[PDB]
C-alpha cells in the first residue's frame, strides 16, 4: 500500500540457500552431535553477527574467500561446552566455548562483538610459561551491507598479533619485533 514502513527489515540480506528465545543457554557436544543442528543452535534465530559467524561457510581475507574459521574452531567434539550469555541482545551476546584442559574445564574461546562492526574471537592458550592464560584476539569486520559474505578477517597487524601471542609462550623478554634479522 505505498508504505516503506511495512517492509520487513533484517540485518544483512543474503547467504540463504534456496533448498531451506533463550537468553542464557549452555550446549554440550557429544560423539553423536548432529553438526548442522549444533551450528543452528549456536547461531540462534535473529539474523545478526552470530548468525553470520556460525552459518556462513566462507569469510573474506582482503579479496580471497577462505573456509569460516569460527565454524572450524566450534566444530563439535566430546568435552566441548558452549555457554551463550545475552542471547537476545546482539550488541552484548558472548559465546564462550570451554574444553577439558589438565582434567578441569576452562574457557578456550570467547566470540563476541568488540565495537559495532568488529567480531573478536579471543582464542586462549592455558598451557603457558607462567601459568597465566595467553589471549590471541583474532578480529573480523562484520559488514551487513554485503549479505553474501558479511564476515572478513582484519588482515592489518594479524601477523603482529599472532607473533605477540607466540612471544609470551616462547620468549621471556620484552615484546619488540624491531631488531635486524642480519
Amino acid at each position: 500500500g505505498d508504505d516503506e514502513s511495512k517492509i520487513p527489515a533484517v540485518e544483512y540480506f543474503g547467504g540463504e540457500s534456496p533448498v531451506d528465545s533463550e537468553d542464557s543457554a549452555v550446549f554440550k557436544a557429544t560423539s553423536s552431535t548432529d553438526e548442522e543442528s549444533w551450528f543452528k543452535a549456536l547461531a540462534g534465530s535473529e539474523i545478526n553477527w552470530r548468525h553470520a559467524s556460525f552459518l556462513c561457510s566462507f569469510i573474506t581475507q582482503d579479496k580471497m574467500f577462505v573456509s569460516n574459521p569460527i565454524r572450524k574452531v566450534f566444530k563439535p567434539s566430546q568435552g566441548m561446552v558452549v555457554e551463550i550469555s545475552n542471547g537476545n541482545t546482539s550488541s552484548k551476546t558472548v559465546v564462550t566455548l570451554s574444553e577439558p584442559v589438565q582434567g578441569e574445564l576452562k574457557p578456550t574461546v570467547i566470540l563476541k562483538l568488540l565495537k559495532e562492526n568488529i567480531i573478536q574471537m579471543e582464542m586462549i592458550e592455558n598451557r603457558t610459561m607462567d601459568g597465566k592464560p595467553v589471549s590471541l584476539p583474532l578480529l573480523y569486520n562484520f559488514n551487513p551491507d554485503n549479505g553474501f559474505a558479511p564476515i572478513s578477517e582484519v588482515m592489518e597487524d594479524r601477523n603482529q598479533r599472532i607473533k605477540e601471542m607466540y612471544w609470551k609462550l616462547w620468549i621471556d623478554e620484552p615484546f619488540n619485533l624491531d631488531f635486524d634479522p642480519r
Partner: protein, 830 residues
C-alpha cells in the same frame, strides 16, 4: 487357552491363536484353504497367489466369509471374527484397508488386481461378521475440513472419458458388492419400472435394463454397442458415480448428508451435473434412495429422448477406414482437439460451417482447458472438419528444432470421443421440450431449499440455488443445448477436488488437475486405487488414510514464489526472490557476453555497482590470458565482492584450459561465485564433476530448447542440495540464439522446474526496463496465455547494457546500436 494354527503359502506364513473350543472347526478349513491355494512359485508372481502374509490372511478371510451365511450364525462365524481381529491388529495399524493396499503396491511385488482381491476379501468379511462401518474414521482429510485447513469440492464426470465405462461398474460390484449391492438392486428395479411405465420405451430397450443380471452373469451382459448407446450409458454412468459416493460415505462411516456437509460445493461436467444436484439433497441412508430415484429418472429420460432426437446412423466404410488409418478413432458426434487454443478451433469450425447448411453445422460444445476443446455436430460434418485439420497438422516424426517458431507446423491431436450422441449442441434442442414434460410426469423436481451446498452450473459458473426458474430445466438445458466452459465453472476456491466420476486416471479429475496445476488445488481420484509416481494428484486411499499422507497440498506458485521486499540494516530495499536471497544482491544479472563482458573494467564497474555479471571466457584463448583478466577484475572490485565466469560448451578447447583454471583459482579462494555454461547443457557426469570439484556457490545453465531444460532438471535431481540457475532465453535474444519462443517452453516446463527447489529460474531475452520485466517477477505474464501465474526468480539484460559508459564497444558502434529501433516480440522472427 488358545492352540496356535499356522496358515502358509511356500516360505511366507501367519500363526493365529485359535481357541481350543473352535480349533477342529478351524483346522478342517486350514486344509480346505490349503487345497484351493495353488502350488507356490519363486517371487509369488502368479495371479490367484499371495505375495505377502497380509493378502494370504486376506484370501483366508474371503474363503471363510464365502462359507459363512450372514442370517444363520453357523460355526465358521466365531473363527471369522477372530481371524478378522487378528488381521486388523497385526496389519491395519489404525489405517483403513485402502491405505494398507496402497502401502503393499509401493514396497512389495503385488499388482492392482491382487490388492483389489485383498480389499474385497477384507470388506466381505467385515459385513459377513455383522461389523458395519458405524464408527466415524479419523481420515486426515476430513479431520482437516472440520478444523478448516481444507475446502472440498466434489466433481462428477460424464461420457467420453472411457470406451468401456461398464468395466468400472463391474469392478465396483466385483469389490464392494456388500456395500453398493442395495444401491444397484434399487437402481435396476427403478429403471425396470421406468421402462414399463414410460410410453414406447421398451422399443428402445430391446434387451431390457436389468443390470443385476449383467453383473451376476457376464455372458447375459448385452454387447458393447448396446451399453455405449446413451439410453443405457446415461443412467449407468449416474449409478457408477453414486456407487463411488456410497462406498466413500460407508468406508468413512458417514451418512450421505454428513459427507455432503463436509463439501464446500459440488459440480458436474456434462451429465455429471445431475448427480452433483442429487448428492446436494441427500440427508441420511433412509432418504438417500429418493435423491438417487431423481438422478436415475433425469439421466434415463435424457438418454431415452436425446437418442430419439438425433439417432446415430451407420457410416460409409471408406470414412471409417480413413479415420482409423489417420489415427482419429471411430467417427462419433463429438471430436476432442488437444493443443489448439479456442480461437484457432473456432476459426477452423467457421471455415467448415461455411460449406455446410444450418442443420449439419458443428459448434464448440466443451471448452475443457485453454488447449483442450470438444466439437459436437453430425459425424459426416466432424469428419469434414477433421480433413481440414490434418492438412495443418505436423507428422509425428519430423524435427522442427532448426525451423523458426512461427514457421513451424502446429503439433496437435484430434480424436473422436467414444460417445453416441452430440451433447451440448443445437442437434438435441428438439428433445428439451420432451424431457421437461416427462420429469413433471414422474414428479422429479429439485428445490433450492433442499439443496444444502452450492452446485455450480456448467455454462456461466453461477450457483443453481440462486436461480429463479426450475433447477431441473436449467440442468437439462446445460447438458443438451448450452456449451460447457469447464475453466469458468471451476473458478471456485478449494484446496481439494474429489473426482467420483467414471474413468479414474483418464477421467474428469486428472483433466481438472492439468487446468489447475500451480493454483494450490489437489485432485483426489475417489473411484480408483492406484499409485501416482509423480504424486501430483492422489487416488482413493488419500481420502481414507488417517496419518499425514491423507492431507497433502499441491504447490501454489503465486503464493510460494511471490516476490517480496526486504530491507537491510542500512535501509537498502531489495526485491526478495529465491535467487536474490542466495546471492544477496538484486535478482538482475548481466550475462557473459563476447565481447562486452570480456573487459575486466566492465565486469568490475558492474560488480562495484551492486549487480552480478559473468566474465566472458569466449574472449580468452589460454588459462594465462584469462588468469591475467581475472586478476585485473579482482584488483578493481571491493573486498567481499564476487563475480562469475561464462564458458561456451561447444568449444571443448576452452573447457579444457577453463575448468582446471577455475578449480585451482577456487582452491586458492578467488571470488568466483559461479560458473555459467553457455551454448549447451553438460552431460550428467560432466555436471557432477563441475558441481562437486570446482567449489562454486551455484552453476548457471542456458538451456536452448525443451530437451535441454529436461537435461537441467536431471542435473538438479542428481544434486538436490546444490543451487542451479536455469537461465532461460528465447530466440529473440542478441548474439548466438535459438529458434524457440520466449514463452511457450516455460508455460510447458515451469511446473516441472518448480518441483526442484534448488532451481533458481531466471528469464532473459528482450528486456530493458522494469515495466516489461515486472509481469514476469509477479507471474501475471502467464495470465495472458490462460495459465495460472508463474513467477520468475530473476532476469538477465544482455543487449540493454551494450551502450553503458563502462562498455568497451567503440563510440560509433554505440551510435549504430542506439539507431536500431528494434521490434516487439510478435515481429522478431522477421
Amino acid at each position: 487357552s488358545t492352540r496356535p494354527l499356522t496358515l502358509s503359502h511356500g516360505s511366507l506364513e501367519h500363526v493365529l491363536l485359535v481357541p481350543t473350543a473352535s480349533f477342529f472347526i478351524a483346522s478342517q478349513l486350514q486344509e480346505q484353504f490349503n487345497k484351493i491355494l495353488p502350488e507356490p512359485t519363486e517371487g509369488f508372481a502368479a495371479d490367484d497367489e499371495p505375495t505377502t502374509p497380509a493378502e494370504l490372511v486376506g484370501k483366508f478371510l474371503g474363503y471363510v466369509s464365502s462359507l459363512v451365511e450372514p442370517s444363520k450364525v453357523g460355526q465358521f462365524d466365531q473363527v471369522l471374527n477372530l481371524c478378522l481381529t487378528e488381521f486388523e491388529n497385526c496389519y491395519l495399524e489404525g489405517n483403513d484397508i485402502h491405505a494398507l493396499a496402497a502401502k503393499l503396491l509401493q514396497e512389495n511385488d503385488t499388482t492392482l488386481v491382487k490388492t483389489k482381491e485383498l480389499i474385497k476379501n477384507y470388506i466381505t468379511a467385515r459385513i459377513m461378521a455383522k461389523r458395519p462401518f458405524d464408527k466415524k474414521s479419523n481420515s486426515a482429510l476430513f479431520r482437516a475440513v472440520g478444523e478448516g485447513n481444507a475446502q472440498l469440492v466434489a466433481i462428477f464426470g460424464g461420457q467420453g472419458n472411457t470406451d468401456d465405462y461398464f468395466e468400472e461398474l463391474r469392478d465396483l460390484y466385483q469389490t464392494y458388492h456388500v456395500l453398493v449391492g442395495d444401491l444397484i438392486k434399487f437402481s435396476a428395479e427403478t429403471l425396470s419400472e421406468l421402462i414399463r411405465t414410460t410410453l414406447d420405451a421398451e422399443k428402445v430397450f430391446t434387451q431390457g435394463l436389468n443390470i443385476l443380471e449383467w453383473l451376476e452373469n457376464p455372458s447375459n451382459t448385452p454387447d458393447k454397442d448396446y451399453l455405449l448407446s446413451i439410453p443405457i450409458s446415461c443412467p449407468l454412468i449416474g449409478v457408477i458415480q453414486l456407487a463411488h459416493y456410497v462406498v466413500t460415505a460407508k468406508l468413512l462411516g458417514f451418512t450421505p448428508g454428513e459427507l455432503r456437509s463436509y463439501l464446500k460445493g459440488a459440480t458436474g461436467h456434462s451429465q455429471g451435473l445431475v448427480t452433483a444436484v442429487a448428492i446436494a439433497e441427500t440427508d441420511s441412508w433412509e432418504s438417500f434412495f429418493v435423491s438417487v430415484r431423481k438422478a436415475i429418472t433425469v439421466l434415463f429420460f435424457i438418454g431415452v429422448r436425446c437418442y430419439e432426437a438425433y439417432p446415430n446412423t451407420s457410416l460409409p466404410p471408406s470414412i471409417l477406414e480413413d479415420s482409423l488409418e489417420n489415427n482419429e478413432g471411430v467417427p462419433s458426434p463429438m471430436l476432442s482437439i488437444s493443443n489448439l487454443t479456442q480461437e484457432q478451433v473456432q476459426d477452423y469450425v467457421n471455415k467448415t460451417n461455411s460449406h455446410l447448411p444450418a442443420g449439419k453445422q458443428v459448434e464448440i460444445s466443451l471448452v475443457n482447458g485453454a488447449k483442450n476443446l470438444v466439437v459436437s455436430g453430425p459425424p459426416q460434418s466432424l469428419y469434414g472438419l477433421n480433413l481440414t485439420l490434418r492438412k495443418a497438422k505436423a507428422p509425428s516424426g519430423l524435427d522442427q528444432s532448426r525451423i523458426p517458431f512461427s514457421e513451424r507446423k502446429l503439433k496437435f491431436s484430434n480424436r473422436f470421443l467414444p460417445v453416441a450422441s452430440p451433447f451440448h449442441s443445437h442437434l438435441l434442442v428438439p428433445a428439451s421440450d420432451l424431457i421437461n414434460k416427462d420429469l413433471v410426469k414422474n414428479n422429479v423436481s429439485f428445490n433450492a431449499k433442499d439443496i444444502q451446498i452450492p452446485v455450480y452450473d456448467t455454462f456461466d459458473g453461477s450457483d443453481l440455488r440462486v436461480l429463479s426458474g426450475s433447477i431441473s430445466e436449467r440442468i437439462v438445458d446445460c447438458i443438451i443445448r448450452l456449451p460447457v466452459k469447464w475453466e469458468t465453472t471451476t473458478q471456485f476456491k478449494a484446496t481439494h477436488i474429489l473426482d467420483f466420476g467414471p474413468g479414474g486416471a483418464s477421467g474428469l479429475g486428472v483433466l481438472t488437475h492439468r487446468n489447475k496445476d500451480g493454483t494450490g488445488v489437489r485432485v483426489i481420484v475417489a473411484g480408483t486405487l492406484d499409485i501416482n509416481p509423480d504424486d501430483d494428484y492422489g487416488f482413493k486411499q488419500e481420502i481414507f488414510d488417517v496419518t499425514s499422507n491423507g492431507l497433502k497440498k499441491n504447490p501454489n506458485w503465486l503464493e510460494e514464489y511471490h516476490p517480496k521486499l526486504i530491507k537491510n540494516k542500512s535501509g537498502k530495499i531489495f526485491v526478495e526472490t529465491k535467487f536474490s536471497k542466495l546471492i544477496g544482491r538484486p535478482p538482475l544479472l548481466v550475462p557473459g557476453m563476447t565481447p562486452c563482458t570480456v573487459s575486466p573494467d566492465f565486469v568490475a564497474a558492474t560488480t562495484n555497482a551492486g549487480y552480478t555479471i559473468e566474465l566472458a571466457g569466449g574472449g580468452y584463448f589460454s588459462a594465462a590470458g584469462m588468469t591475467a583478466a581475472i586478476d585485473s577484475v579482482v584488483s578493481q572490485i571491493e573486498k567481499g565482492s564476487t563475480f562469475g565466469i561464462n564458458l561456451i560448451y561447444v568449444n571443448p578447447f576452452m573447457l579444457q584450459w577453463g575448468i582446471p583454471l577455475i578449480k585451482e583459482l577456487r582452491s586458492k579462494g578467488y571470488p568466483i561465485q559461479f560458473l555459467t555454461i553457455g551454448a549447451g547443457v553438460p552431460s550428467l557426469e560432466v555436471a557432477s564433476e563441475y558441481i562437486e570439484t570446482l567449489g562454486l556457490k551455484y552453476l548457471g545453465l542456458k538451456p536452448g530448447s525443451i530437451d535441454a531444460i529436461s537435461q537441467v532438471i536431471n542435473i538438479a535431481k542428481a544434486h538436490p542440495n546444490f543451487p542451479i540457475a536455469l537461465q532461460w532465453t528465447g530466440g529473440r535474444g542478441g548474439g548466438h540464439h535459438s529458434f524457440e519462443d520466449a514463452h511457450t517452453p516455460m508455460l510447458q516446463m515451469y511446473s516441472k522446474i518448480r518441483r526442484h527447489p534448488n532451481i533458481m529460474l531466471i528469464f532473459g531475452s528482450g528486456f530493458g526496463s522494469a515495466d516489461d520485466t515486472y509481469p514476469y517477477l509477479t507471474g501475471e505474464w502467464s495470465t495472458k496465455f490462460d495459465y495460472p501465474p508463474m513467477p520468475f526468480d530473476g532476469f538477465l539484460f544482455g543487449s540493454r547494457v551494450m551502450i553503458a559508459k563502462e562498455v568497451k564497444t567503440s563510440p560509433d558502434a554505440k551510435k549504430c546500436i542506439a539507431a536500431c529501433t528494434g521490434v516487439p516480440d510478435d515481429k522478431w522472427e522477421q
